[PDB]
Design a protein around this ligand. Structure first.
Ligand SMILES: *Cc1cc2c(cc1C)nc1c(=O)[nH]c(=O)nc-1n2C[C@H](O)[C@H](O)[C@H](O)COP(=O)(O)OP(=O)(O)OC[C@H]1O[C@@H](n2cnc3c(N)ncnc32)[C@H](O)[C@@H]1O
Ligand SMILES: *Cc1cc2c(cc1C)nc1c(=O)[nH]c(=O)nc-1n2C[C@H](O)[C@H](O)[C@H](O)COP(=O)(O)OP(=O)(O)OC[C@H]1O[C@@H](n2cnc3c(N)ncnc32)[C@H](O)[C@@H]1O
Ligand SMILES: CCc1ccc(CCOc2ccc(C[C@H]3SC(=O)NC3=O)cc2)nc1
Ligand SMILES: CCc1ccc(CCOc2ccc(C[C@H]3SC(=O)NC3=O)cc2)nc1
Lengths: 494, 499
């Protein structure tokens, strides 16, 4: 019944918040709707796969909070395989390459591609990470979709196809679904185009040995019986001295403060007394999550490596079910596997099929792209469609349709009386990722410590020392990349 | 706790559904979250106003279901005042006019305005009322906002300005917030541009004597103790032979079937066992309601009539808090009043002020638009910001952002095991309105009667005889309206002769 703080949600953010408060000497309780912890992370274990991340998996340089938390819990990382060549498959042909950038051979098309990525980062430099609505052109950019921006910027269909894939893969949503301002903020707050797309020296550099689900699991181990599973919160009452929190299974909890560590829209599943302020009331109806099926096909051997391919495939176009893959083989070289994402509208379309039907489509696609009949002989298959999850709403994260971020963005982390807001969606660096989940959970926890008079105001937001295990190398550009003209810039010189 | 059908929501749609089922001999229960029925309709009564609709109010020709239901319940309508001139206020100046269309004198501007409304209706004719996602260019149109479509179509700032106000006023949302396909559907399913904008011969022709809240109240009277107030539904369980419905105040109800008669996104407030199918699970996170404050300023007399103004003002410009007003005086001629809407972003922006501050801003605006110092002397004020409502989510209705209607639209009224879906959002004619609430409630009820083997399949969807009290004049166009060129059409003709 009685405690200092109730945390709603036992994903990484809620767990990180509860741990910090617990370590500080407060009595905490975590109320989790599911029969498991981890939320948008989920590590499946069976003999065929050993373990596999069906939700969030990747960590990399500059994500120092998640790396520090995992290390403390006794976890280690290994590198996602990028020794051999990456593949860009365009108009029915595979083009192997090295470096983070797919090569472009046509000179006009080259200028167009170069300008697109450069312009994304140029625009990002004017968007504050902690307040994107304060961008000088916030309203102009928020009132446009990414489709509109791409249509204006890309003079070649080639650039437009890759730019579209980029949007789809970053935020599991269609270019026409999302605000340009929000999307440009999203990329900038991960460190820019190069950092977000990169395996080596980027967001996809590493995975956790044994799976990312261990983060939430091991914190639940540390919290004893303070984690309550199968307790979906249904009601929060702030009319009295202590806050009252009621669960679906009829239990009542009493606390001084609450942390909401669930996706913003899932706040709708809770009935509030008194009602929420107008702006939050409407905000939580305006913020959907994206759509994705994560699919892992297993093979006897990582056969692609013999052809000097690392397993990374970037696959343009409408026909392909999967637009992007990475090698999911274990560090020992066993449990050979390819991870692929079925993105946005394709998640919706292909959900109608059977598991076996999807397996066949993926195997035939991979056989074409890798140029190998070995892709047609899988030994095992696992997948998860995150669109079906009542207590997630989708994956990877929440996207903002046009007009929403400028009108409602401010209220995302604004406290409501004694309710404070965590969740990766409220982070200012790697929001959308496990890193942002840690940042937001610890910040929300420290807001409460400050409310209790335990720490000063300047300690609410705290820097993180760089990981020694996963250090970051700087992102560089070339002289030509910085100074080559766009297509219309070349036209104006003519 | 045992019944045949549980209806979730006691707005017009749930009440219409419950009444039909009750009349058919079934045992119904209505579970309503609030301490009142009516939902997005709410009639305030006090001595200063007598009565006033703070939510949905207007009915008109072609809305035959709401008119028939209200008539059966003993209600009467009266006509909104449109005897005198309307006002279009643009660039700080007022232009009085008659007819549904603000006058446009500049011939280029006239062609552009004519073509804009014509094209809205032309495109609408391509969109099936019962399946907008089946339009030939559904995907192209759904992947565009209304802002993009206006930018393409309007060759004058004058047309773009009025078109923007039109969207804001129809759906309480910004042009950049909404899908072009969805908005084009929304207008077409109300009968088109002329019908949706008109007072005389359109959606705003009439109000109910005594207020629209009487519709839901009188149905509650008919149903007696079957309506349960302050029972917000939290949980629906379909894993066993009969459906189990749990409320916040700790009550359990058992039923053969359920009708969900709440705004689609408010489905999120219910925990489902088993979980909803993927498409509905995501759909209910993708469908917000609009933003509006409805404001009524009272005066000693309807002084605007003396200057040959009916009370209708169409007000363009960022600075104006209210973009549209109608005379709200009682049919007897007393309790003189102006009704105004604060729309979309302005509802958000102006919510920060006090009630007294909003009243001052409205009076100052009305004084300028009407050229009348008497507008600075209000005797009373009432208002309601629908953005603050936990159990509405907004008003008037649900809008669809770009890309959503084609991807998720088909599941809006698709049954989920033994749950059937009512609510105005699921209607095919005047969706968003009290009329659509009746259509959807009665249709959902008949879906259940069919499932029980009580009526044949062809009786699920039923036509409605035209009101004898509110006849519908047809929507007509002139030869010139049909065949005058667009601005680019004129330019093509110019470039053709110059050869
Ligand atoms: C789904 C997904 C996510 C993902 C990704 C691929 C997929 C398919 N790949 C990632 C990656 O490679 N690297 C990375 O860093 N992130 C990746 N992501 C996203 C990542 O998983 C998320 O950013 C992160 O997991 C989010 O953490 P957070 O703690 O903020 O949120 P959550 O996991 O959703 O946890 C919320 C918990 O709350 C519970 N819940 C929901 N409603 C209630 C109620 N009413 N009462 C009590 N509890 C509730 C949820 O069940 C959940 O456990
Ligand atoms: C708000 C508004 C609406 C409006 C308008 C002006 C404003 C300011 N002008 C209109 C007009 O002039 N003419 C017209 O025909 N319509 C106008 N509108 C729209 C109109 O009010 C709506 O279309 C109509 O009232 C909607 O009816 P419907 O029955 O479909 O929906 P509802 O009124 O919202 O009723 C839903 C009920 O369900 C209850 N609820 C919500 N959640 C729960 C849960 N969890 N459990 C139990 N009950 C629940 C709500 O409280 C409500 O009563
Ligand atoms: C800047 C030039 C460029 C343009 C597009 C691509 C194709 C690959 O793009 C990517 C885009 C996003 C991501 C990150 C994706 S992958 C994941 O697990 N989670 C993510 O957020 C990974 C790769 N490569 C290079
Ligand atoms: C076709 C040419 C034209 C273009 C716009 C206007 C300005 C008025 O536009 C209107 C637009 C919508 C509405 C209906 C609004 S008012 C209400 O109570 N609920 C509604 O849906 C009423 C008027 N007049 C004429």
């Amino acid at each position: 019944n009685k405690c200092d703080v109730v945390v709603v949600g036992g994903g990484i953010s809620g767990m990180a918040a509860a741990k910090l408060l617990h370590d500080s000497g407060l009595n905490v309780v975590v109320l989790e709707a599911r029969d498991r912890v981890g939320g948008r992370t989920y590590t499946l274990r069976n003999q065929k796969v050993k373990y596999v991340d069906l939700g969030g998996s990747y960590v990399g340089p500059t994500q120092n909070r998640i790396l520090r938390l995992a290390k403390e819990l006794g976890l280690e990382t290994y590198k996602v395989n990028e020794v051999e060549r990456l593949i860009h498959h365009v108009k029915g042909k595979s083009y192997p390459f090295r470096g983070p950038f797919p090569p472009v051979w046509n000179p006009i098309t080259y200028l167009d591609h170069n300008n697109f990525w450069r312009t994304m980062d140029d625009m990002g430099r004017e968007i504050p990470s902690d307040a994107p609505w304060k961008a000088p052109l916030a309203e102009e950019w928020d009132n446009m979709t990414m489709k509109e921006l791409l249509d204006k910027l890309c003079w070649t269909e080639s650039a437009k196809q890759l730019a579209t894939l980029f949007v789809n893969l970053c935020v599991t949503a269609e270019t026409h679904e999302v605000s340009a301002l929000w999307f440009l903020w999203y990329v900038k707050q991960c460190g820019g185009t190069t950092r977000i797309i990169s395996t080596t020296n980027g967001g996809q550099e590493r995975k956790f040995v044994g799976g990312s689900g261990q983060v939430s699991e091991r914190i639940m181990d540390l919290l004893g019986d303070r984690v309550k599973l199968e307790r979906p919160v249904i009601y929060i009452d702030q009319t009295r001295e202590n806050v009252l929190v009621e669960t679906l299974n009829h239990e009542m909890y009493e606390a001084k403060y609450v942390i909401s560590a669930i996706p913003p829209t899932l706040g709708m599943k809770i009935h509030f007394n008194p009602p929420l302020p107008m702006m939050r009331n409407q905000m939580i109806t305006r913020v959907p999550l994206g759509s994705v099926i994560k699919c892992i096909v297993y093979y006897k051997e990582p056969f692609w490596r013999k052809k000097d391919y690392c397993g990374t495939m970037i696959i343009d176009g409408e026909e392909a079910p999967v637009a992007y893959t990475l090698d999911d083989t274990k560090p020992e070289g066993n449990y050979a596997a390819i991870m692929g994402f079925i993105l946005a509208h394709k998640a919706r379309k292909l959900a109608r099929l059977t598991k076996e039907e999807r397996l066949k489509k993926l195997c035939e696609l991979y056989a074409k792209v890798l140029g190998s009949l070995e892709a047609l002989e899988p030994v095992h298959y696992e997948e998860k469609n995150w669109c079906e999850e009542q207590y997630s709403g989708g994956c990877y994260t929440t996207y903002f349709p046009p007009g929403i971020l400028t009108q409602y963005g401010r209220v995302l982390r604004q406290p409501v009386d004694r309710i404070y807001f965590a969740g990766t969606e409220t982070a200012t660096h790697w929001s959308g990722y496990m890193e942002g989940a840690v940042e937001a959970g610890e910040r929300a926890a420290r807001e409460i410590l400050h409310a209790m008079g335990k720490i000063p105001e300047d300690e609410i937001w705290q820097s993180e020392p760089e990981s020694v295990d996963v250090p970051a190398q700087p992102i560089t550009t070339t002289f030509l990349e910085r100074h080559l003209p766009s297509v219309p810039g070349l036209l104006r010189l003519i």
